[PDB]
Amino acid sequence: STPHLVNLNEDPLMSECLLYHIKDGVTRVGQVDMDIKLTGQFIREQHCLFRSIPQPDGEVVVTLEPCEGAETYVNGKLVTEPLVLKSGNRIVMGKNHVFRFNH
Length: 103
Ligand SMILES: [Cl-]
Ligand code: NI
Fold this sequence. Notes:
Subcellular location: Cytoplasm, Cytoskeleton
Bound molecules: chloride ion, nickel (II) ion
Organism: Homo sapiens
Protein name: Kinesin-like protein KIF1C
Function: Motor required for the retrograde transport of Golgi vesicles to the endoplasmic reticulum. Has a microtubule plus end-directed motility.
Family: Belongs to the TRAFAC class myosin-kinesin ATPase superfamily. Kinesin family. Unc-104 subfamily.
Number of domains: 1
């Protein structure tokens, strides 16, 4: 299937987005001029980005790259360099945005 980024927040705001499909290419996450806009106090203008790249068989590989000074955690570990995501991974951006990556 397409990879999904699913919003795990228990009380998401009306403006807040519950589910994104991660499309082929770069999805930029942040506040100012991004493909996914998150508003929390700790979300930087350019927070991080997803890369979706195809394999020989069509199956996709999604990586997450954090931006300088923008905190993101995958399964509890702060991610500081780019990282290949896996279905089930829990991603927190800033302190107020929790997702699951579902492939
Ligand atoms: Cl935040
Ligand atoms: Ni879907």
